[PDB]
Amino acid sequence: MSRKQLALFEPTLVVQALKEAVKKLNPQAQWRNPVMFIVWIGSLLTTCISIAMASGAMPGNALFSAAISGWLWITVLFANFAEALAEGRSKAQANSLKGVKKTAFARKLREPKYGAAADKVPADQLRKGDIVLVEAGDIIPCDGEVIEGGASVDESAITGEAAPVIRESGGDFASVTGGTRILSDWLVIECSVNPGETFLDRMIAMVEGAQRRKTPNEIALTILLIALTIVFLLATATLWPFSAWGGNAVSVTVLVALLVCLIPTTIGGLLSAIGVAGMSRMLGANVIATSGRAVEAAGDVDVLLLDKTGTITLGNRQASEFIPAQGVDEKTLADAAQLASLADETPEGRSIVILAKQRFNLRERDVQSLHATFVPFTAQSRMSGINIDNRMIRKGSVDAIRRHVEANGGHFPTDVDQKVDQVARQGATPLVVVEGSRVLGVIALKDIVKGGIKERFAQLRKMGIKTVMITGDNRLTAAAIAAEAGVDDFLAEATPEAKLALIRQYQAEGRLVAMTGDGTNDAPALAQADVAVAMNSGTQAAKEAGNMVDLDSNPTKLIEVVHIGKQMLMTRGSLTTFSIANDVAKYFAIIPAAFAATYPQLNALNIMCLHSPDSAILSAVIFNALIIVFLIPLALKGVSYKPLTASAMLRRNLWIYGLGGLLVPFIGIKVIDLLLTVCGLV
Amino acid sequence: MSGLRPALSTFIFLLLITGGVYPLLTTVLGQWWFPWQANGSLIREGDTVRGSALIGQNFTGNGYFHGRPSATAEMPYNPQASGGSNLAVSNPELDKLIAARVAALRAANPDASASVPVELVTASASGLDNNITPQAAAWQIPRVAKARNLSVEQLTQLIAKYSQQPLVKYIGQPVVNIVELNLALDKLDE
Amino acid sequence: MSAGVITGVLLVFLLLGYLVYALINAE
Amino acid sequence: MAAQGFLLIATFLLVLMVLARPLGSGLARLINDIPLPGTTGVERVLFRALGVSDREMNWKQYLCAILGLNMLGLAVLFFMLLGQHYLPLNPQQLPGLSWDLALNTAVSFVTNTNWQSYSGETTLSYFSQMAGLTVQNFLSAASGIAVIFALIRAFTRQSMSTLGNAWVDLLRITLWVLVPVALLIALFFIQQGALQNFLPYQAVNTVEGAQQLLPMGPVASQEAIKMLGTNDGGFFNANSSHPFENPTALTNFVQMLAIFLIPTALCFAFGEVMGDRRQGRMLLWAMSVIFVICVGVVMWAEVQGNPHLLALGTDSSINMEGKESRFGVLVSSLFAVVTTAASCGAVIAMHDSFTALGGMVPMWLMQIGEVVFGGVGSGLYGMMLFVLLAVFIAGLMIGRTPEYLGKKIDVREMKLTALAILVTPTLVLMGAALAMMTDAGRSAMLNPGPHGFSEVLYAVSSAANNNGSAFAGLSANSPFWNCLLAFCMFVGRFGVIIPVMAIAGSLVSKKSQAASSGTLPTHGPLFVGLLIGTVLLVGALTFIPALALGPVAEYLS
Ligand SMILES: CCCCCCCCCCCCCCCCCC(=O)OC[C@H](COP(=O)([O-])OCC(O)COP(=O)([O-])OC[C@@H](COC(=O)CCCCCCCCCCCCCCCCC)OC(=O)CCCCCCCCCCCCCCCCC)OC(=O)CCCCCCCCCCCCCCCCC
Ligand SMILES: CCCCCCCCCCCCCCCCCC(=O)OC[C@H](COP(=O)([O-])OCC(O)COP(=O)([O-])OC[C@@H](COC(=O)CCCCCCCCCCCCCCCCC)OC(=O)CCCCCCCCCCCCCCCCC)OC(=O)CCCCCCCCCCCCCCCCC
Ligand SMILES: Nc1ncnc2c1ncn2[C@@H]1O[C@H](COP(=O)(O)OP(=O)(O)CP(=O)(O)O)[C@@H](O)[C@H]1O
Ligand SMILES: [Rb+]
Ligand SMILES: [Rb+]
Ligand SMILES: [Rb+]
Ligand SMILES: [Rb+]
Ligand SMILES: [Rb+]
Ligand SMILES: [Rb+]
Ligand SMILES: [Rb+]
Ligand SMILES: [Rb+]
């Protein structure tokens, strides 16, 4: 969530409250981290060896073994500290969004009315198939669709938006969630969530996964870290017979110190911290993403698919203007529109009557229920209307009414075509109305674009994602909307099966596409798409179909999704490169130090001019401990991602992180050894 | 069958092709085209093989050009062993052998330069080295000249006659056929 | 060989077996 | 000397690329399952007569075919070496080999290592040297090329499940690449002076009066195929550098060209089959930079040579010890790097007598897994694991899904790639540790100090990495050494062939994503340097603790 913003990574309270848990991550329940389990077993072995020297054993220098064991334990504490810090930041967000379950009141109406039965029930007793009534000011006790009535809803407690979100019965603005506050008037909603599968429970399942699933990239990186651990363990453990033939063999504690300094302890300790911090940053960008696998798979998106009515535009779509045709009066046009829009629950159909009756100041006062015969809006039919009398009234798109009038016997006039493409050039969506194979006229449906998103679409162009606009409007109205929004291309006059066909076409080409939608109409297309950024303002069906749902309802939130996904992958690869690159200075510090009595001629490899073998090995272990702490902020923040070319960005990452892993451990080991020599412990 | 007949058939046919026809065709074409080279480049006087023009022999007389030292198992320049001295740079035994060889060569060649060539003091890779550099062959002119009553010009002309150079100077070194040079020395004596 | 070398080789084989099991599995 | 060395490297690489590009096209035609021109009809008769119906095989069936052929060859070779006293072509009546020696050389010549712990001219008869140890020289090379054919087919085929016919691949390789080229190579070697006969051993009355017994035998026919198929071997104890095996400098140059011929033509064939020549030129550049750097380092080390030679009264300090005078130290260094980077194993010179750096760099070149124009087939599918590591790391640091040649590289590929890479360093370190912990392995040394450990580590590295080259100061004829190196060679080949075949069978089922704007190009100087850095860094950090107690300690002593 954006508002109620998370504090710094170290607010000096959760540091203590999680280091207390880090002290409880010490025992043998580290079996799931092999790189850290190797360090744990080596630290226990060095502790037992130091205890043996303290109580009487063959070798000496119990203080050196004690210091090595203590610093290996400190390495384990630091690598658990990063993981517990990320996990406790996630738990802090979970506790922030966990107090939403407040109310214990819910009305039980037998029929959806203004009011039927005010039987109060606890909100935990609500199950699927029930209806409630929320007044103007009350909070929502469940998540579900709206049956009757509309009301302005303040979703600040969930999304952070101070601006209220309009919810209206029917259409794509019917889903409402709990914790939000009604600000306008009465509202009757349905109960569509059972206890245990609400939107807040989805949020808690995202942020507080007790068995948090590992992404395939994380598992493959873990496999490579295990392989590096195996080769370093063998190359370190076989050093004892080699030095035994050389003379006096190397001590076991020096071998364990070299083993810990060689294996990738850094990335092996910060991997889970990277994943959990990626979830925390993902929720901090107002996205409720079910799977980190989906988050990381969103990083290679090259084509983004957008809805137009519910995603790029707000979806109010007021019927601003009146346009009559030849031989048609505005009274007849308004009457046909009002009769066609009596029982329509779409926002456009409601807007038709609720402005047209006030504009013309005349109203056909009967309700639709008197001699009722009404047909709903189906998206593939793309046409609706009323046929209460023997005469018929229908409204819909140009293609729908044209097919209807060729079926009836008439024809659509060229004057009507001139008015249609004139209002399409103006930008309003035209709905053609018909009565008895007579085209009365069109209605201008003015719609508003969701702010200045042209800069975000230019950012998407710069990042390499080509965005197209999927809609069902005319070819020219969608062209005007695309010109206003600054998108790359569009596909107009598309039935949802054609949208799904376009998804299959772009997916069979090998491209991994992303789709952003809000409505139930686009729900199977979102479920088919690889990355499906649903909208909170949309429908519960689209929210369930999408693998990640927004809360700010931004059309270009895939920018942030790709940001955190590529930050995860780049942080993993960069810390891996740093960890393998670090071993050169560890070799240059330990090998002339470990082989100093068996082979005294190997001191020429001591290019850092370290004081003594014990100081060199102990300084290497100290740097191996401290690099984890110095890279906790990078693991918890992610690396700095800029929209560069793939080759140039790889070159930048190689330069920065490879040269850091080469030169930085030299400087760190030399500074630590110099500080130790100055202090006098070595 | 079902994966066993093709396996046995392919293995048996490849065995026949690469252990019958191919070495038999190679041998037939070799003996037909280059029989002297294919038979070992043997050198004969009368009906007695005096050696190969490629292998090389142990030479210790004063009137014979000496080759590189050999580290074969039973005797120096033994074709039944054909190994080399696998002695390390850090091995003191190699330094002892090099010092002994240098002392022996300086005793045997007093009129030559005191800087012995490394060819005559380093054991070759196979032991059977028939070749030395022309510089190493011209280093031992005075000993052979004093033992053979020949001229320096005659000895250098004989070495240049029995000197083989590669196609280009960087894929090898100029070499002197030691056995052929000593046989030519014997023929010039006779 | 004394008990120390046997214990070291046993520990190395146990670590290698655990690491190979971890590489094979998706823990 | 530096100018001569640079000219030698440049000439060798230029002639190598010129000779290897048409062979690259020819091998690409066999990868694409298109018969060679003029081989149509003969194939139809021969495959039908054998019982090979050109049915396509999965990775499991392909791998079982390769393993069955190799086990049949192992059994045939082992029983032939045991019963060599009962077979013809024995003009010396040499006895049958012992069980340990016979098993070791059978595993050597089947697993393409061709390690030899004996003396050939006093151990092996003409039948066991020609119908054995040369048939396997063809067969192990053909098996390696068949496995890399399966891998390249996996990279070029989309969404299928089969990998072609292993028997068809082996027959095509052996009859149309391995035999007709090695026939010309053997004929040139016979012309230059190599042996090819079946005569008994020729007694020689020398010039001085001593008697020596010259050994005869079919030398050039085996020499051509051990150079073509990157095999070790040799009729004699000296692998190369015997005058009857490597008579002239032209023969040595042709030997080096034949050693790098098929491993370079395989990269050319891979680049042609993929449709992008940059995909093969990347591998060639990545191999060539490391190769040139290693050749220069070994050349400089051998030119500096023994520091005690000038002190003890010699003319120069050039390390002429253990090298032939028919070549130079420059040519010896180049041949040593060629055979230790190519998993060949033939020695122009005793590597034991090399300097510390010039023994370290060949040893390290074996230890990195033989990827620098490596073993025949095996070099390409060994560097095709480091390429998978590089594309995984680069895909992570660009934020994209890891991807090579369009196909994704997921968890199963990483698991099998790690398992394939782990086999050779694990065997090297365990074999060296077991030889260091055992007196039967420790008593085979010849040179004292760190260099005996260098001998042991070199032997175990060459066995595990299928090189076969040796310092030869190690007395590896012990039963313990024979069994240890046999286990190392067997696991080091057949624990890499199996997971590469599993990688191929999991990669055939994938599809190739087309090139996009954000896809990382797997060619160019950046990716060449990235793959070079990955290879050198992995091969360093695995073996610096092992190399710092041997050749490094000897150099600093
Ligand atoms: C730090 C160390 C750095 C190490 C560097 C190592 C460099 C090695 C490079 C690796 C090579 C592999 C990649 C290239 C292979 C493919 C070649 C190719 O495609 O050409 C185009 C290729 C890229 O062009 P493109 O635009 O992408 O595509 C064009 C098509 O390929 C157009 O196709 P095409 O049709 O025009 O070509 C086909 C055919 C067209 O022609 C024909 O039809 C046939 C013509 C030949 C037929 C025979 C005629 C006789 C010719 C003599 C050959 C004799 C063989 C016959 C046998 C008899 C022998 C007596 O020609 C060919 O067959 C191949 C062309 C010749 C290949 C050159 C060989 C490359 C290596 C040689 C130099 C290496 C020196 C470095 C080592 C020394 C360093 C110490 O360009 C190159 O060749 C790149 C290599 C250039 C040379 C290397 C540059 C560096 C050299 C200096 C190194 C400095 C090191 C510093 C060290 C310290 C010193 C002080
Ligand atoms: C840990 C270490 C960290 C490393 C720190 C450093 C990393 C960052 C370096 C940044 C350097 C700053 C920028 C310098 C730019 C200027 C230098 C340059 O020219 O190269 C540009 C290069 C970017 O090139 P690009 O943008 O991708 O190429 C597209 C072109 O711009 C335009 O596209 P195009 O298609 O038109 O290109 C045409 C042409 C462009 O090139 C041209 O040829 C010029 C155009 C001539 C006409 C075209 C005809 C071509 C025929 C002639 C070709 C011969 C030229 C080469 C001569 C010999 C040169 C050796 O390309 C080609 O021809 C393709 C053939 C391939 C060229 C041969 C490759 C040379 C060998 C590379 C040796 C590198 C050794 C590094 C060893 C490091 C080991 C640690 O940037 C580099 O400097 C890369 C070199 C450094 C390699 C990075 C090492 C990474 C090591 C990390 C290992 C990771 C460890 C993993 C551990 C974890 C494992 C579990
Ligand atoms: N009440 C109504 N009656 C009839 N037709 C209507 C209508 N409201 C809209 N239409 C028309 O039906 C078609 C549906 O377009 P719509 O905007 O719903 O597709 P879309 O993909 O852009 C949004 P979604 O996928 O959420 O439904 C358009 O041609 C529109 O003008
Ligand atoms: Rb690795
Ligand atoms: Rb480390
Ligand atoms: Rb080999
Ligand atoms: Rb390796
Ligand atoms: Rb090989
Ligand atoms: Rb390999
Ligand atoms: Rb190999
Ligand atoms: Rb490795």
Residue numbers in the entry:
A (entry chain B): 1 to 682
B (entry chain C): 1 to 190
C (entry chain D): 1 to 27
D (entry chain A): 1 to 557
Task: Copy text verbatim from the article accompanying this structure deposition.
To this end, we determined cryo-EM structures of the complex loaded with K+ and Rb+, both arrested in an E1·ATP state. To incorporate Rb+, we employed variant KdpFAG232DBS162AC, in which a central glycine (KdpAG232) of the KdpA SF is mutated to allow passage of Rb+9. K+ ions co-purified in the intersubunit tunnel of the variant were exchanged for Rb+ by applying turnover conditions. Here, the KdpBS162A mutation prevented the inhibitory phosphorylation in the A domain, enabling turnover. In both samples, the complex was trapped by the addition of the nonhydrolysable ATP analog AMPPCP prior to cryo-EM sample preparation. The structures were determined at a global resolution of 3.1 and 3.2 Å in the K+- and Rb+-loaded samples, respectively, with higher local resolution in the transmembrane region. Both structures are nearly identical and adopt an E1·ATP conformation. When comparing the individual nonprotein densities in both structures low-pass filtered to the same resolution, the densities in the KdpA SF S3 site and the KdpB CBS are increased ca. two-fold in intensity in the presence of Rb+, close to the expected factor of 2.524–26. This suggests that the densities at both the beginning and the end of the intersubunit tunnel indeed correspond to ions, not waters, and, consequently, that the tunnel constitutes the ion translocation pathway. The nonprotein density in the S1 site is absent in the Rb+-loaded structure, probably because the mutation KdpAG232D changes the SF geometry.
KdpFABC (K+-dependent P-type ATPase) is a K+ pump that is responsible for high-affinity electrogenic K+ uptake into prokaryotes at very low extracellular K+ concentrations. The heterotetrameric complex combines a P-type ATPase (KdpB) with a channel-like subunit (KdpA) from the superfamily of K+ transporters (SKT). The channel-like subunit KdpA consists of four nonidentical, covalently linked membrane-pore-membrane (MPM) motifs, referred to as domains 1–4 (D1–D4), which are arranged in a pseudo-four-fold symmetrical pore. KdpB is a 7-TM P-type ATPase.
